[PDB]
Amino acid sequence: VQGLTEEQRMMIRELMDAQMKTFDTTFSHFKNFRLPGVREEAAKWSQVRKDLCSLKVSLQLRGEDGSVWNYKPPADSGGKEIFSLLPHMADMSTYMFKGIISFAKVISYFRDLPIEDQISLLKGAAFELCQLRFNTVFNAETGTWECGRLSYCLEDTAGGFQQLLLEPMLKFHYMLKKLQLHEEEYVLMQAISLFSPDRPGVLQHRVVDQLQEQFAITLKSYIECNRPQPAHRFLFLKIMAMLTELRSINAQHTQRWLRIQDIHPFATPLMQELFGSLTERHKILHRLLQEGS
Amino acid sequence: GLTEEQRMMIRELMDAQMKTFDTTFSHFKNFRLPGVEAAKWSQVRKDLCSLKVSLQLRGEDGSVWNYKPPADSGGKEIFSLLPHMADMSTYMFKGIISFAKVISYFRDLPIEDQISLLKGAAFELCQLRFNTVFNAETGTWECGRLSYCLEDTAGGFQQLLLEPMLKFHYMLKKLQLHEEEYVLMQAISLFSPDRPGVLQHRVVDQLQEQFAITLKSYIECNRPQPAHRFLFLKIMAMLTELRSINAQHTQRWLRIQDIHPFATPLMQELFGISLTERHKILHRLLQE
Ligand SMILES: CCC[C@H](CC)Oc1ccc(C(=O)OC)cc1NC(=O)c1nnn(-c2cc(OC)ccc2OC)c1C
Ligand SMILES: CCC[C@H](CC)Oc1ccc(C(=O)OC)cc1NC(=O)c1nnn(-c2cc(OC)ccc2OC)c1C
């Protein structure tokens, strides 16, 4: 810990603080979410059916009393069986994104940036910081993202563990979990993703790139000061590689998402703004940035 | 063979059953589902731990929603399924009220004896219908798209067969009764002269004797006589066991209601909570 500059210490101290105050590990305040109800365009339909089959999951909504609802998704047959859990996942991604917005809103280096670069940075890193947070609740053995009450469990396939790791996002979660990262390396990862200066729309490239660098320098140091075991050799460069891969996956799933919205509109109002004057077009985002935490 | 009157007796009952029993439960809509004085509270917790089951809802999409019941905590949790079973009971009671009306023998009775017979026969007729959807292998009442599965209680069939009502369903299902024999049981149960509030005792007793003789005669005629020699008596004993079970669960319901009111308005009438004035809903249902 001392091996880190007092500036670095305070930097991990602020990031971890913002994570605790803005990340709901228990999803306890995740409420009012929708649940599954109790030719050229046809080629587009065929593409979407492959996207959704990779991320087929069952939803286990546990209850304080001890009860457990479990939804087994319908097997694909015709149309819209596939879009059954989509209204829910949209509600849950918005709840996730709102905490990512609040994470950044608490960080000093982010709070001082021009509001149009706060909007643009969050637009580029919303998925990446979401997936990084989801990884912390991912159970590699069960194949479940354990989100407090709700648990999303990967549906068993015929291809087995081999068929799953074909999906880049499922592979990303399994590889990143394998690294057994500390909370500090996750929040530092989330900050290197957030402060990416090459995102579309960022106009303070220098300030953001200078900030990103010091986040990676703090990450390389923390790994040097708190991780001397041989399994963690090249852990930093492994982490940095994964972040580059998450940017690749972020791009893949910005395309899958837009295609689904084209076929079957499902996006919440805020999610439509992620996918589109900056302040004017992103009215809900601008509002939330201005609000307190 | 059966007398032509007896044949017509069965014909009417089977007709009533066909018009008033939704075997797929396809019209059981809008039911409440599980969301997501110290003496009375513990007695109630004892009552509710005997018949724990897991609701399963199956969608047209092929999705399955499964409600595992909440492990007993003796609190608000224990009453999680009551708001639902209260809606199931009402839906079932309304179909039982309707069964009785289709029967000419019941419509002729005085409107006050109709209320009394239904008051004492509603539970029995409900459980008789539930048995026709009971799957003894899977321990599940298959109510069309809803399935209620008796949850393993760690004692296997031993603990369940202890509970007189689960024993009843298993025992009755082993009798492999016909649809005609099920509906005749309902009549024999409905037209019971010893029920509280009856005034035409001889009229009802005579009617129940004619339904029972039809059932006795049906078995002799339409079943290998030597093997099913005592089947009619087996049935009569179960109707009797059901009258005893009716009372136990009529008390469980009153105890569970005083601690926490789950009852729908029609159920409250059924449990005593002029006679035609004390049961105004049920009266309306009988004259519409
Ligand atoms: C359970 C949580 C983790 C798990 C990882 C496999 O997740 C799913 C499970 C199953 C499905 C699914 O098959 O049901 C359609 C979909 C998702 N995952 C998103 O639904 C999703 N994850 N991130 N984002 C997203 C969020 C943004 O704001 C933060 C911005 C852009 C985004 O781009 C896709 C979404 C819509
Ligand atoms: C559909 C499932 C069949 C299975 C057979 C035993 O049933 C249950 C399973 C589980 C439970 C349970 O887990 O408990 C919350 C409760 C019941 N069963 C009643 O809830 C119930 N069944 N019949 N009646 C009733 C009806 C009346 O008029 C029609 C009048 C009085 C009645 O009761 C005294 C009730 C309240």
UniProtKB/Swiss-Prot annotation, chain A:
GO molecular function: DNA-binding transcription activator activity, RNA polymerase II-specific; DNA-binding transcription factor activity, RNA polymerase II-specific; nuclear receptor activity; nuclear receptor binding; RNA polymerase II cis-regulatory region sequence-specific DNA binding; RNA polymerase II transcription regulatory region sequence-specific DNA binding; sequence-specific double-stranded DNA binding; zinc ion binding
Assembly and interaction partners: Heterodimer with RXR. Interacts with NCOA1. Interacts (via domain NR LBD) with CRY1 and CRY2 in a ligand-dependent manner.
Tissue spec. comment: Expressed in liver, colon and small intestine.
Full-sequence portion shown in this chain: 140 to 430 of 434
Gene Ontology cellular component terms for the protein in this record: chromatin; intermediate filament cytoskeleton; nuclear body; nucleoplasm; nucleus; transcription regulator complex
Gene: NR1I2
Principal location: nucleus
Compartments, record wording: Nucleus
Function: Nuclear receptor that binds and is activated by variety of endogenous and xenobiotic compounds. Transcription factor that activates the transcription of multiple genes involved in the metabolism and secretion of potentially harmful xenobiotics, drugs and endogenous compounds. Activated by the antibiotic rifampicin and various plant metabolites, such as hyperforin, guggulipid, colupulone, and isoflavones. Response to specific ligands is species-specific. Activated by naturally occurring steroids, such as pregnenolone and progesterone.
Domain of life of the source: Eukaryota
Family: Belongs to the nuclear hormone receptor family. NR1 subfamily.
Native organism taxonomy: Eukaryota, Metazoa, Chordata, Craniata, Vertebrata
Protein name (database record): Nuclear receptor subfamily 1 group I member 2
Sorted UniProt keywords: Activator, DNA-binding, Metal-binding, Nucleus, Receptor, Transcription, Transcription regulation, Zinc, Zinc-finger
List of residues binding hyperforin: S93, Q131, L132, R133, F134, H253
All copies of domain NR LBD, residue ranges: 7-276
GO biological process: cell differentiation; cellular response to molecule of bacterial origin; intestinal epithelial structure maintenance; intracellular receptor signaling pathway; negative regulation of DNA-templated transcription; negative regulation of transcription by RNA polymerase II; positive regulation of DNA-templated transcription; positive regulation of gene expression
Species for this entry: Homo sapiens
